[PDB]
Every structure is written in structure tokens, then in C-alpha cells.
Write a protein that binds this ligand. Structure first.
Ligand code: NA
Ligand code: NA
Length: 326
DNA sequence: CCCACGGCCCATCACC
DNA sequence: GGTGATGGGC
DNA sequence: GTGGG
């Protein structure tokens, strides 16, 4: 499908999703609207009626009614109204800052802080994460071309190996499935010295080296197993690269490839694979694959030494990341 | 009618 | 000060 | 808001 097919509808539903999440604080309605937008976005025909749309899984009575109003009038009265609402549109907007969620956005707007410029004038009311989100507001909303992701991966893999050649690092996400662009960089890290049965500095060493070569520029959060921060490719006399979001997670070696599988996705592939695993008497989560007994009691985690090991357990042919869209 | 809709790390708040 | 809750993000 | 038990 292409946009102009049903883009008016899917844009409408996405906008409604955002207000549910950010203003109404109704996360399950947010996801309902998103699910409806997704299934409509994949529908190979231009929708003629709400009833037609209601045949799709995830589109119910209320969304059908909204589609009817949109098709007849070219708008939704409720959406048009909350759009002109100074308070609600401001709350919705501020959540675009990384670190500002529905609660902070509401609190800010309640005390007269509505805009980016208002945040800029009120730095002492922002925590560290929020200050960084504000600083890179525009950059964080840009997508990352695959060519830059490859340059970023080059640096990550090199520096990781430099710290300890026994580290294993994998860049996951849509990038690993071959996407032409990414929203951020997601790095999974492990080391043979770190198992589920098993130093408390393995993640720190890698973050520190990436900071020393001035690739990592800011830290949003950092613990013993999870880093979230900011990075930037070195500038060529040419214009600087945008700052990018990068996550780095340390995973025990015996749970690594379950992790790599999960964080490679897609979300639909994951759901389908876990569905088929149940079929075969296995349960798969982010960490392990375990056999299910005859009454449904999960046994010990099975040995996994590759992604293929997982596919083999559930009698499925290994599918390359490229072939994991669903 | 009524409940699920992912779960967990990290930063920070709420309270003791 | 310590412990658990909450917000945020993915 | 939707689906399903
Ligand atoms: Na439906
Ligand atoms: Na935000």
C-alpha cells in the first residue's frame, strides 16, 4: 500500500493515539489506535466505509464510526477541537522531548510552561535526561541513514574489540534486518566471562572507551547492564552530523542469542515465532527458551549458542534477519 | 460483563 | 540514611 | 478502544 490510499484515515488514527497516550494517559487506547492504523495501512484498497474497515482485526465500532465521519466530512470534530486546545496540544507536544512523559508534560503545562522556548528558560525544572532531550530535540527526531549506521557500527565494533577482543557485540533493531534507515542504534554486548551463573565493570569499560574516542557525547542513564546515551560521528570542513540515540545492553553469554533474536525483531516476527514455539511445547522470551511439560510447567532453560539453535529447537528453518519482517 | 493489552532497568520521587 | 513506588523509555 | 473469555 501507499499513503494517499488511506493516509487520511491512518493519520487521523495516529493523531488520536498520541493524545490518548500523552494527554488522556490511556496507554491501552493509544495502542488500540496504533493497531487500527497499522492494519489499515496494510489494507490493499481505498476504504469506502466504516463497515468495510470494521472487518479488519483491531478496527471496532467506534473507529468505524470515526471513519464514517471522516469519509463524509474530511475531518473529525473531536480531533479538530482538541487540536485547537492550547492546553492539550501543548501537553501532547512537550512529550516529544526525550525524558518528558505524560506526567511531566502535564505538570509543566499546568504551571505555564508550554513550549520549547519555555523549557529553555526553565532549565532548573528539568532533570538531566530532560535537559539532554531538549538540547538535541531536533536531532533526535531525524532518522539515521543506513550509511551512517554502518559508519557508527564500524566505530562501535572496533572500540569494543580494542577493549577486549573476547567481547561480542551485535547491532540489532531494524538495521540488522537491512533497513534503509534507523531511529537509533541498539547494541547488544556479551563476554564469555559473564554468564547467568556468574566482572561488574564489563559494560563500563566499553562505554568509557567510546567516550575516550569522543563517539559517545552524553549519558542519559547507565547501570551495570544497560546504557542509554548520545553519540555522534566525527565531522569530515564539512557540516557536523546530527547527534544520535544509542543504547548498549550487557547480556549474559547463555542468554545472548535469545536477546539478539528478540531485539532484531520485527515485533510481528517475534509474536509469530513465539506462537509457533508454544505449538511445539516451548516457551520463548527475551532471555531463554524452555520446554513446557504436559501440564504446562516450564522446565530448565535450554542451551543456546546461536540464533539457529533456537530455530532448531522449534523445528523451523533459520530465517535471515532480512527475512524477518513478519 | 469483565479483564488483558510486556516486562524490566535506571533515575528519581514519596515516605519512613 | 534505607526501601519501595513512580515515571520514563524501549 | 478492541477482542475474548
Ligand atoms: Na474488527
Ligand atoms: Na518524551
Amino acid at each position: 500500500p501507499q499513503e494517499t490510499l488511506n493516509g487520511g484515515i491512518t493519520d487521523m488514527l495516529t493523531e488520536l493515539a498520541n493524545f490518548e497516550k500523552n494527554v488522556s494517559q490511556a496507554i491501552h487506547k493509544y495502542n488500540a489506535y496504533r493497531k487500527a492504523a497499522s492494519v489499515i495501512a496494510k489494507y490493499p484498497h481505498k476504504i469506502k466505509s466504516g463497515a468495510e474497515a470494521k472487518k479488519l482485526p483491531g478496527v471496532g465500532t467506534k473507529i468505524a464510526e470515526k471513519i464514517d465521519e471522516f469519509l463524509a466530512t474530511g475531518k473529525l470534530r473531536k480531533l479538530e477541537k482538541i487540536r485547537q486546545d492550547d492546553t492539550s496540544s501543548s501537553i501532547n507536544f512537550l512529550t516529544r522531548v526525550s525524558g518528558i512523559g505524560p506526567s511531566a508534560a502535564r505538570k509543566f503545562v499546568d504551571e505555564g510552561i508550554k513550549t520549547l522556548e519555555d523549557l529553555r528558560k526553565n532549565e532548573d525544572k528539568l532533570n538531566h535526561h530532560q535537559r539532554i532531550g531538549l538540547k538535541y530535540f531536533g536531532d533526535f527526531e531525524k532518522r539515521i541513514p543506513r550509511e551512517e549506521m554502518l559508519q557508527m557500527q564500524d566505530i562501535v565494533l572496533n572500540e569494543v574489540k580494542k577493549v577486549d577482543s573476547e567481547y561480542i557485540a551485535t547491532v540489532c533493531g531494524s538495521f540488522r534486518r537491512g533497513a534503509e534507515s534507523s531511529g537509533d542504534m541498539d547494541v547488544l554486548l556479551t563476554h564469555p566471562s559473564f554468564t547467568s551463573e556468574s566482572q561488574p565493570k564489563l559494560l563500563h569499560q566499553v562505554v568509557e572507551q567510546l567516550q575516550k574516542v569522543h563517539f559517545i557525547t552524553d549519558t542519559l542513564s547507565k547501570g551495570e547492564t544497560k546504557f542509554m546515551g548520545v553519540c555522534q560521528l566525527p565531522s569530515k570542513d564539512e557540516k557536523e552530523y546530527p547527534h544520535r540515540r544509542i543504547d548498549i545492553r550487557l547480556i549474559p553469554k547463555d542468554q545472548y542469542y535469545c536477546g539478539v533474536l528478540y531485539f532484531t525483531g520485527s515485533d510481528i516476527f517475534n509474536k509469530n515465532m513465539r506462537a509457533h514455539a508454544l505449538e511445539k511445547g516451548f516457551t520463548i522470551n527475551e532471555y531463554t527458551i524452555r520446554p513446557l511439560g504436559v501440564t504446562g510447567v516450564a522446565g530448565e532453560p535450554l542451551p543456546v549458542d546461536s540464533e539457529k539453535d533456537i530455530f532448531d529447537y522449534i523445528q523451523w528453518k533459520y530465517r535471515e534477519p532480512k527475512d524477518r519482517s513478519e
